[PDB]
RNA sequence: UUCACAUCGACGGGAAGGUUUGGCACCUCGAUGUCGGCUCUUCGCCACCUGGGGCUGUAGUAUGUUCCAAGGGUUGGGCUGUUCGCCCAUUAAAGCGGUACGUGAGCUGGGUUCAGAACGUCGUGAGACAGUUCGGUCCAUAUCCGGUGUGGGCGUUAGAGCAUUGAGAGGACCUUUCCCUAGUACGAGAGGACCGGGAAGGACGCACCUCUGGUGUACCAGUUAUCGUGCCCACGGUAAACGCUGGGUAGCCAAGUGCGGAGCGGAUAACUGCUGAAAGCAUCUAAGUAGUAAGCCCACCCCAAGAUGAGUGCUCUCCUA
RNA sequence: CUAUAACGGUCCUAAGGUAGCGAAAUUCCUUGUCGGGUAAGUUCCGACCCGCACGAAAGGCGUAACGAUCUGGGCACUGUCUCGGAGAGAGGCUCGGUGAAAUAGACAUGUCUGUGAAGAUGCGGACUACCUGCACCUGGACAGAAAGACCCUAUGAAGCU
RNA sequence: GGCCAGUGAGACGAUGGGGGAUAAGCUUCAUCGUCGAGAGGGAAACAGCCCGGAUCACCAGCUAAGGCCCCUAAAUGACC
RNA sequence: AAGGUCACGGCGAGACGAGCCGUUUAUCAUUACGAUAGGUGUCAAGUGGAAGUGCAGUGAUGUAUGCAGCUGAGGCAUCCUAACAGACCCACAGACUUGAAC
């Protein structure tokens, strides 16, 4: 029984699953609008809107914690510049998850992520 | 559970288990067993065709 | 676990029907998504 | 929590060391032995200069256990090893001097453990 | 048939009550979201019984369809969403039309019972539904936790009906009986009852005085 | 009670008695106490 | 001590049961897998305990034997492959059996002692022992019935949303010490009641996470080896499906926490009776009738009108050509 | 004194078992009796010898070291267990693709009880069951295998003596 | 006699016995009946028990064994 | 048509079906309903003093900022995002017959 437990798991074991978290929300803040499944979508929400107010306040400690977050380097230094002068006044909601037709090959419920 | 048991508890199962013996046990039995109406009461809420009395031909009752 | 017997007609075309009314259920909802994906402001299928 | 196969540690000088509790009387569970519960004892070692030796079965107390104890007052008590008191079924054991703190419900039935303890918490 | 009209509350969930003597007592406490509103009696005359019909959770008319808001527009009443009777005996005095009883009828009543959901555990195994035992988890053993021999031999021919196989466990509704009532809240609209009900916080619980 | 199946009354006040479709024996003494066959 | 029948009952006799060893060889060898254990039933009474009673060589406690009663229980272990059995600590008691070992298409050891080897004995020998010892593969995706859950269709005579009655069925109705009565009846003492209450337990069951914890791969914290982040700091990856540890919220769980097992309710079995005749005496009965069992039913908790006998009550909607 | 036989005679053989061992890998009775270990020990060790049926190169009695050898006990250690519980993966469940197999007389394939080639969904009487899926469990279909390795028969086969 | 087959495992029931335990749907014989190789009716079902011997048709009648309350045909027939 | 089903956002419900709770000018005001899920802002709560700087120390390290820093499965608030767009099933007095009064 699941009863409370509200940490989404995917198909794939827990570091995997961490993996698949930070190298998707990192291409994710690469290109803005990504192709994802809706499991993989929702799993990108919570923690893209974690990391567009973790350099909301673009102090040092934050700007650590979201480097270490994320993979690449020279993606962490283009977000706190681009971050309050675009989703400041938002407060919340950063993402959208329009939903399209699903994969041939699979039947996979297929889902596309917005920044908005 | 004894027959003093029914008949203070639900007395119109005791008639309606002793005609459901006597007659023929397949599905047209079952459909001729709807036809038997025991009512507990002095007084059943039948008005459909004039019912007239049943004729006996037994003289041992 | 190995079957005693076989099926008949009977319960074979039972069976096969109830797997394909079971595939006519998961079209309606293909007609209401085909027909929902039509002109009209639907915030989705970009 | 006093299995039937536990080592209890003397809480008094009878004359003995430690013990293989044997299937608790009173509490028909005897899987779960809590305070107060008497115990078939079994001497597993002891003092080789008092009428109590080897392979001697006893009866003992229950005064002490690793397992918690539930008071109406909220508290909670539990000890660091389990303990017991060479009893016999007449109230007194026949060791006068008892070592370690004990809790104070056995008091009312066991009134002489209490009385011969040094600390009652 | 019940000794007497009870109420219905949510369950919001549980503390401990220190009482003046010492002791703490685990308790759970009780809300309630609106009044317990007599909506529709159902006497000997018009029907088989005599039960009075309350009902709980007022709302927006839209989470109500039809006939039930017209079954409850005909006692002149609030929307509401639960519904409810207690069989009482033949000396009631109960109108339907918008009887808001007040709780204070249960404080000198030092004893209840309640009903309600227990949560769900889903298709759970016959280790846990009938409290068995599992079987040697080594010594070569290859049926750990298995349900183990299901009937006799060749003379029954077929296993006994109501045998112990695993299934849903949780999701019924139970009862359990003469709970002790604790301190009221008259303006809190809360009530503390020493005991556990069934469920998580948020469900209905059915609150209605003993049957011994 | 002595369920002697089959043995005669023997005090000289066993009176025989059939109660209830059994045949009992009583007498003075209540060793003679006997429910018959 | 007297005394066949409180209790045993010699010499004999009459039955029931199919649980042991047997007899027959009637189904099965183009295969019905024996013995023990684990898990999990269910049933019988020829009753070990619990409930009621009679008799006692029953003063009371405890009995001996026996009647009704199978609802419920019938421990943990050392030996042995063990069934059986012996012993220890107890317990109210640690019942005997059926269901093909009850149960190996649910699971494992001694064995129809399989193939290797050794000891004794037999045989000239190959080999053999209803003698002993060591080692020795055990398969499997449920077609149908059966079961436990959970739907979908259709029916319930318009179509629905709720609300319940309850035919029927399940579960629970179990049990022990300690105290008052009372050291009172009884007994020369020693001992020590019935009956009616209370309290603490045990198993079982239904729940719950407020406390105490176990787990908790949401988490945070310490640290080892190493590779990346250009480098120091600080982090990230890996050391299976946590690198190893230290704790933990919400879940789940118990060892923890609450609750349950109620009834001067109905009828009975054994028994005690009240009037009371067939034989003007009598007798529990032939007429009527009273006390009373953990047993039966109802009440208790849940499901429940597919109860096709398809229920009852309230409410909504059937319009245009 | 009860014993037991140092010792004796007799029958038959080729000779009547020497040292050591001895309820043993050997002991049926037997869980022999005693002692140790254990709360309790048909297993273990130390003894007695009543050795069914030890015994001196088919060697006997011993022992250091050795053994994935057998067996008895103890310390530490733990889910083996009391008495289970939680969590992570691969399956299992659902969806999309691909897609078998053993088996199979036709199956419109209930329970009790009785009968019957003596263990019946198929026969008889009664009771109970609306139809049809899905997920689990395996009591029955004397379930699947595979012309019973055990037992017996063959005027069978073969190895060996 | 000629040509030419099978069969040579029997079973139960009555009587006459032996083996047994005057136990077995047990075993072996002797006479007979049935089944084997025999359908139908009665026996609830059910090889051997009773009636009875099926060429075939009839939407014909009378009977044997056995039955005449209902399931299920015929008497809730009569008198002791 | 009433009422359902799909879809939609999920659940203290759940193998799948089920079930349950939402499905937006998602109040306006004098006092119980129109916050479903995520994010956000705070409060319980867990680990427990983060980085950076200064100070002391040769350095390991300790100390102040600082119950701080992360975690936020739980509570409340907030319409910022997604609850948009739809579709489909069920309709049109409910056969036949007696009795009663109107």
Known sequence: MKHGRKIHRLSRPADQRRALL????????????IKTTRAKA?????????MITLAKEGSLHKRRQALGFIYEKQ????????????????????????????????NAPMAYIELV | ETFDQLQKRIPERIIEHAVRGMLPKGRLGRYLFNHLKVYKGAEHPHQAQQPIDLPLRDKRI | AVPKKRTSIYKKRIRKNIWKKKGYWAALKAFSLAKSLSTGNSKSFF | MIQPQ????????????????????????????????????????????????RSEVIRAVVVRTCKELKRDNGMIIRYDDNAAVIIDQEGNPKGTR?????????????????SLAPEVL | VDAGIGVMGTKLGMMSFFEEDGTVVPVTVIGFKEGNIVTQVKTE????????????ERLRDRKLTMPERGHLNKAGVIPMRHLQEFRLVSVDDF???????????????????????????????????????????????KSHRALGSIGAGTTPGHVYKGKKMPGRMGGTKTKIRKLKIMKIDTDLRVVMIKGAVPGKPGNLLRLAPAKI | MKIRASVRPICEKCRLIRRRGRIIVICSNPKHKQRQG
């Not at chain 1, 930070?22 to 609008?33: A, E, I, V």
């Not at chain 4, 008892?98 to 209490?114: D, H």
């Open chain 5, 95 to 141: 109108t339907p039309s918008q009887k808001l009883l007040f709780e204070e009828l249960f404080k000198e009543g030092d004893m209840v019972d309640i009903s309600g959901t227990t949560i769900g555990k889903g298709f759970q195994g016959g280790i846990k539904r009938h409290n068995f035992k599992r079987g040697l988890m080594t010594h070569g053993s």
């Open chain 1, 42 to 50: 929702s799993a990108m929400r919570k923690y893209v809107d974690k």
């Open chain 5, 45 to 56: 005359s018009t029907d088989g019984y005599n039960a009075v019909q309350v009902g709980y």
């Open chain 4, 98 to 114: 008892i070592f370690g703190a004990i809790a104070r419900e056995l008091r009312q039935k066991f009134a002489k453990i209490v």
């Open chain 4, 6 to 53: 536990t080592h209890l540690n003397v809480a008094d000088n009878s004359g003995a060391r430690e013990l293989m509790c044997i299937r608790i009387i009173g509490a028909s569970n005897r899987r779960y032995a809590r305070i107060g519960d008497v115990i078939v004892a079994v001497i597993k070692e002891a003092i080789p200069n008092t009428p109590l030796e």
């Open chain 1, 22 to 33: 930070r190298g998707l929300t990192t291409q994710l803040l690469k290109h803005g609008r």
């Open chain 1, 75 to 106: 993606i962490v230094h283009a977000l706190f510049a681009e971050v309050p002068e675009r989703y400041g006044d938002r407060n919340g909601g950063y993402t959208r998850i329009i939903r399209t037709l699903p994969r041939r090959g699979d």
